[PDB]
Design a protein around this nucleic acid. Structure first.
Lengths: 76, 97, 64
RNA sequence: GUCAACCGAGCGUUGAUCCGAGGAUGUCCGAAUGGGGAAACCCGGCACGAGUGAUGUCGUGUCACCAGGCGCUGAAUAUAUAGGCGUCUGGGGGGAACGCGGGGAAGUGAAACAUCUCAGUACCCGUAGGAAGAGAAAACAAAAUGUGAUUCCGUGAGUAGUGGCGAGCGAAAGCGGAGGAUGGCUAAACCGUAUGCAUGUGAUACCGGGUAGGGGUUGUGUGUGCGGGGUUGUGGGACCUAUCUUUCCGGCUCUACCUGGCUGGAGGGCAGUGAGAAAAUGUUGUGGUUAGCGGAAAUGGCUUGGGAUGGCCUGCCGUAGACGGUGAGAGCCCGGUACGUGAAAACCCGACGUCUGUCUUGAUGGUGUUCCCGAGUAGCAGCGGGCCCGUGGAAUCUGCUGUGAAUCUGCCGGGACCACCCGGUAAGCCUGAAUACUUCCCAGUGACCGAUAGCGGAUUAGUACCGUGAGGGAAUGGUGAAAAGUACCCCG
RNA sequence: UGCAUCCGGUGAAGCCGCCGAGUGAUCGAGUGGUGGAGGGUGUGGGAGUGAGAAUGCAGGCAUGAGUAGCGAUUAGGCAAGUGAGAACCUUGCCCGCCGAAAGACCAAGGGUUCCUGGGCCAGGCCAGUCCGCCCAGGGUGAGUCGGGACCUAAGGCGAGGCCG
RNA sequence: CAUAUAUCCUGAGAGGUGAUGCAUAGCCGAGUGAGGCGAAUUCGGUGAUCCUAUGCUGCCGAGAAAAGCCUCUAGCGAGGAC
């Protein structure tokens, strides 16, 4: 899926099908969710493509400190 | 540094029946630098021969493709500048006509 | 023709004057060769070398 | 320079040509980057300068995009941000192989075929480095007082096993070895400082005891940064705490007073351009590389021959009888060889120090409780990948999605699982050597080819030629010792 | 090829022969010729080791065969010349062909084929004095032509950007 | 206020000029080809697939953009236009 920004979760690749063991390839894309992230220091909301695990952790740590780590990594 | 002498544009003269006839008509043909232009050439000729130039006409001449045992080989693409001086113009001697 | 040893004595302006003179000589020599009026063909190489030495000296003084 | 002469000019012991090193110049294209563009060609802006009677023209610089910093500004819109302007640092592309991570075929084999194999191959993508990756146990092992980072090699073993139990696939431990640095740092708890944010028995509360000020050693919390302090498994560490207690001085240690920590300076160690902090600096190694130089010994006789390097005979050198050349098998003719010398400069290795860092107010060894020991993690479930292991009883490892703990009587692994025991101490980082490879450079070798061979290419070679294009892709060596390459006459 | 021996510019190999030999592949340290520089033998070692066939590969050369054909639908001829040489080149005169073309000019494309001089072993389907062939030299002059420096279409590239 | 053989614009072409020139049928000798001189040049007819015409008429299938040009002001403006 849309290759998260805060957590970098990309898709896994594998092969999923049973009853004949055929194994045709697929992908196991992350649960990327469009989210409008806000930075209460600057209250405007920019649309990002982030993971659900990212969302859980960023509600744990608040948007602020994780945005600090994210901008420190330098990604948009 | 670099010294932009006008004599770097003017490489050599053309020696031929046509060039000689044009010399009788007070019109001198030179082999000029391929990246030059008519105005550059006019200025250069004026500064060189202390003369006044009426017009300048340029013809690019492709190089002849000559053969050989190895195959083919091409000469240099020259640029000719035909230069009509003004009326009196105190003509040139350097052509050894 | 002239040596770098005796070109390094000259000034930048003297060198530039010599450069203009050598380019003039080269012009006249190209014309002489085109017209057939030049026996000594090596004057051309000589003059080109003089020009090269002079430019070399000037750039040397510019840099260090 | 040469094919490859010829002509014409010249240069050179006042040291050319030539060889090496360092520099300079280095059109135009090309990442190509002022803009454009059918690559190598069209058009420019700005500044400076030249040139023009002025416009024209010329030259030198500079002008791409993106990212990251820094400074100014801060739209809708108020906070402010997005963004804009400026500047600085960098990237961009190429490269034969090797590497790491990802993606990932099919022919084929299975005498069909789909599982499987081919094969994690080919190919592709992203990335490097001179090596990479991995690496300092949440390991192995099995009750041996065991080993003790990692990698690689050999064995283990074509075994155990796996497998439409078919074709086939296929370990690991253990052992022997290479190399050795069983290496080093950190987060956390505690303090201290600074700072943001929100607040303020706003005083009996802010050092350690007691006095007095002070109006805060903020009453504080709380988050971050910085410095210490602490980096472990026999659990350790911290907080308390108690015995001993190697340098000196100063200033703080809220304040002055006795006493407890910090911080500067000084002797000294200890290390260092290293993973363990980082650069620069010199002096200096008959240390090395990048040019080369010297280098013994037969004009020997006779004979054959166009020619002796052949034969016969004389000598000689030999740290040199290696290999080639020279008119035919040459140690003694030549280049050279053995051997020995040689670097102004550049570069690379060192050494010595400047210098840098650190310890230096320090350690020593003990006693009993609270705190900490890496969280959206582990674990669990679902689907998958890969492990000998093809989902099987399937551990370990691992991706995605959900769910989701504990901090040592804790957690993980010891092939479902439980108990006991053992081992280890994840979720944080770094780390040389042994290892792989050769575009290129140097010196050499061949029971390798010797021109239909050997590189496709001894020759015009990725050329000619073919094809729109990707791309395909040739053939062509030998006179003679020396051109002495047949003057001159005759037929034409 | 290791080793040991031997031959060789007083002529090795290879090639052509003669005279011969062996049960065979084959041999010839028997001979001559040619030729010009490396070879023979024995004993071991190793092989890119033996071709007549693969509608095999490459080269060279035959058979057909001095055979077909010598590329339209217009048609050549005479004189004179040049020259070593002329059906073809040159000149002249005739004849004939095209004449919405077989004429004239451009674009695209080609790239010097243009012009002059010279040449004639290749090429030209014959020959060749000729040539679009070979050699050398020369030749393409723009403010107004066609284009750029002016404009945009389709479409392309595409700052940022979005998506992946 | 006007419906205008008004006015304006456009515009083939005629005529003039360009042109006392240039060119030419021909003539002189010269014969490689160098030159030199140079007549008349009015009338009609026919007649375009070309021009007026990016017109006009008709039709539906309903027929490029941008530059350029013109104009407008914003703005610049002390010199500037012709």
């Amino acid at each position: 899926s849309a290759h998260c920004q805060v957590t970098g979760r990309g898709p896994g690749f594998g092969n999923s099908v049973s009853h004949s063991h055929r194994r045709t390839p697929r992908r196991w894309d992350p649960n990327i969710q469009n989210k409008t992230y806000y930075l209460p220091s600057e209250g405007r909301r920019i649309r990002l493509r982030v993971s659900a695990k990212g969302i859980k952790v960023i509600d744990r740590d608040g948007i602020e400190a994780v945005v600090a780590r994210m901008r420190a990594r330098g990604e948009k | 540094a670099t010294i932009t002498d006008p004599r770097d544009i003017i490489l050599a003269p053309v020696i031929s029946e046509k060039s000689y006839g044009l010399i009788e008509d007070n019109v001198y043909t030179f082999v000029v630098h391929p990246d030059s232009n008519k105005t550059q050439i006019k200025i250069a000729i004026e500064k060189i021969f202390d003369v006044k130039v009426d017009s300048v006409n340029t013809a690019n001449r492709q190089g002849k493709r000559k053969r050989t045992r190895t195959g083919f080989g091409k000469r240099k693409s020259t640029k000719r500048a035909i230069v009509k001086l003004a009326a009196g113009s105190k003509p040139i001697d350097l052509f050894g006509a | 023709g002239t040596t770098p040893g005796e070109l390094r004595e000259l000034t930048d302006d003297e060198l530039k004057d010599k450069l203009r003179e050598s380019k003039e000589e080269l012009f006249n020599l190209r014309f002489q060769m085109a017209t057939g009026q030049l026996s000594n063909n090596r004057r051309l190489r000589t003059v080109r070398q003089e020009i090269a030495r002079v430019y070399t000296v000037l750039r040397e003084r510019e840099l260090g």
